[model samples]
Target: GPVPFSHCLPTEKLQRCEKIGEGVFGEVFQTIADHTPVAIKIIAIEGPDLVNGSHQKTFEEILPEIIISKELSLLSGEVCNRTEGFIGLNSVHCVQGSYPPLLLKAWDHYNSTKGSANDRPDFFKDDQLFIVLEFEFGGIDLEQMRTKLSSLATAKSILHQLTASLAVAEASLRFEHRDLHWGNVLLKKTSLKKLHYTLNGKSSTIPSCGLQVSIIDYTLSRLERDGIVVFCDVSMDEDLFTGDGDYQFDIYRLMKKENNNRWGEYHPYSNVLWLHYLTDKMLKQMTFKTKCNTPAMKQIKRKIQEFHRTMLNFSSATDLLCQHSLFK
Candidate 1:
């Protein structure tokens, strides 16, 4: 039998289960269980027969949480070594009742405290299913900071991190995150402290002043099958561009869409496509305002010029923009 909604029982014990957010999927709230502060995302499933056991596990297959959970499961080792690049999934539960809701983990904020992973005060059954994720408290969405990125170094760091994560996704899981944008990217403080060893044989502390970038929200991500991946959202009647999802950089896609006949079939190149956009949008935006004319700034200018030149010559995969000096 399917497990009953475990977290929904006894509101008196869940005193701190207060609503913190609401999205198209469901409501999110923070609650204390086992004395540990955790975020719970409650996703409600509609329809009259959903709760009457008519659906069984059919609803489970299509849930976005399930898809994201599968993606997270594909990730291991270096991909999840630290919480900087991705959000960790702890557990998941399907509450069986009227309007059965899926209770899953949300993001978390951990600051390297001793008891950060300590046991929580027990308040639920051993069979209880709930997803617990690391909470990111002092985090901001990259969407708000895209235009406000002041320094080129910071921009480079962010791009480097994003590319690193993309490399992991493609190499390890054959995954392509379709819905990547400023909104899904998160900027957070690093939990790992930077220690500097000096010539005096003493260690010096450089405060954890680095901004770590994490890519979140993989609801629209696609895993490759064979050598090709296709988008299901498009109509079969129309020509479905042979690639990942439509949730991609507008300018690059615009470039491809403008010259569709020239390129023929639009096969998605995950990291390469992102590198093109990262240069055009984030890096270019930062370098444009730069007046210092530093060596780094000059290099960025040359890269931008090279990127534009290569993009104009793009005829096929043989002439990918990432193959040029700009990406190198």
Candidate 2:
């Protein structure tokens, strides 16, 4: 529980760059640490003041978040059921005190450079604790690049990448990525034609569509690792299920029913429901590029539609991905 300032020449020479983005969880800064590009996600803990105008996440509320990231990142090194689709962590620190001078400048510049919002952190106290995560920077999220995915081939490839990896993670950890909307899924452009994973001691590969997918935001996730079960009680906050105009919210409503409102229990059908939302977005909601009416595009669309129609039949992500050969 050291403060960030005692060692601040700000002199550690860690390159704290612009603010990337934030959510109810915390703010992230693009920085260079350990001589590598890093994304610094900071969350305030043990504070009397509400963070982002809602309930402030207590230290007790934030520990499982850290554990989820740590365990998921460790999965990439596994011999079987290995997945690299989740964002990986480099370092995390529980630094207490006021926001650092360098970070404030970055915050101000972020508001000035990118857009508006994120008021100054000057109000933070010396006793305030920050959960800082220096993690691998995957890329901008799908919501930010909605229209950028122009072709059906490109879009379908992304779904393939996401599904294959999810199967691996699910098989190993009983993991359910409870909130996987476009915003929570990060996408980066890639030249590689295929991405790989290991499930049940064998390697599996999925074709890529000039992009890679990396899942983020595990605040609402559920899983068991090393006999330790972790989950967030979404019933505690029902506001997320109330949103309209999108299909993701329906998944939220259905998730509650599948679990009977029990947050700690495992429900693979909730996982399939997410795949439900995913297919709905691609087939009806999202607007793709110029080749929309092409024969190739049309065929892929029908395949995706068929996949979505009976998605509920599969028990878990692993069962769904392995049972069908649609993407693989």
Candidate 3:
């Protein structure tokens, strides 16, 4: 049986529960132990038994929550440490993000180039709703960490950490974090100077964590099978089920439409633009304490450029993009 929680639970109790963080549908509170923490997801699954004329979709929306809860359960156990945290639990605080497994999958998918791990069953169990993952604690995301850094060097270090972490995530999970963005990534301060250091050696406090970005939030993840698109929202369109649910079918139509729109000279710039927009959005969200407007833009552009270059070279990107188009 699932534990019942309330969305309106008192906020004051957050800290009392060793509340390390709060997320949609839940709050994460640290246990008495400095490291161990439990995530309590609170949601209102039912309304007052529906008087009349209630939106069916509103009630149906709860289905996703229940599905997500079950989905989260698929990712359980300690094996996730080697990869991006699929699911994790510990009696101690080691620096994991605040979101649970599903959210973590969403996070990993965000930064993925080929799409999220959930896109392909080859990377995991076909029906694996959730796989528990484990990963290092990233104190806070880059957006939060920016408040503490004062140099482009520090920012660059953070970028490196993000890339490295993503590489690790992909290598372990076999999925790309296509949505890697500022909000998706977290940061932590590694070195804190003690009062004793004030009298003796150099007292200059420097960050040592290298701006590590932990992938999180795995929901809305792309799923890959012989066909494209996961399921049809019959409520949205009754005809969808009637028609083949091949979402990729639109890809062919899109390429044709785009080709026609450009007189058949389309250079795939639209896809690049989309990716740029995403990366730009992520960069804009960063709160760098240092005024690194120019450098920040440069780094962002560089990352996008690298990503584009990689996509161009990879067969998966070609297959996916070619299969997906705006024609439909």
**Which numbered prediction scores highest in lDDT against the true structure?**
2
- lDDT of each residue in 1-328, candidate 1, tens digit only: 4455544434442445554444433345566656665555654443322322222123442354455544544443332321235565555665544322212212121112211221121223444333323232325666556655555555655655565555555544455565565656677756655422121122233223367666765544555445454222322213234445433435335434553523322333534555555555664444324453789766765655566455544432223422445434
Q: Candidate 2 on 6-42: residue-level lDDT in tens?
A: 3421444334566888777788777665566778788
Best candidate according to TM-score: 2
Ranking by lDDT: 2, 1, 3
Candidate 3: where is the Cα deviation over 4 Å? 2-40, 46-81, 84-138, 160-181, 191-209, 222-278, 281-328
Q: Which ten residues in a row have the lowest lDDT in candidate 2?
A: 6-15
Deviation of model 3 at 88, angstroms = 2.7
Instruction: List the candidates' TM-scores in order.
Output: 0.55, 0.90, 0.41
Model 3: lDDT equals 0.33
Candidate 2 ranges beyond 4 A from true positions: 5-16, 109-120
Residue-wise C-alpha lDDT for candidate 3, range 97-197, written one tens digit per residue: 12233433333444363332222112222221221222234456555554666554555444333333333333223233333334455554445321111
RMSD of each: 11.1, 2.5, 15.4
- Cα distance off (Å), candidate 2, residue 173: 0.6
Who is ahead in lDDT, 1 or 2?
2
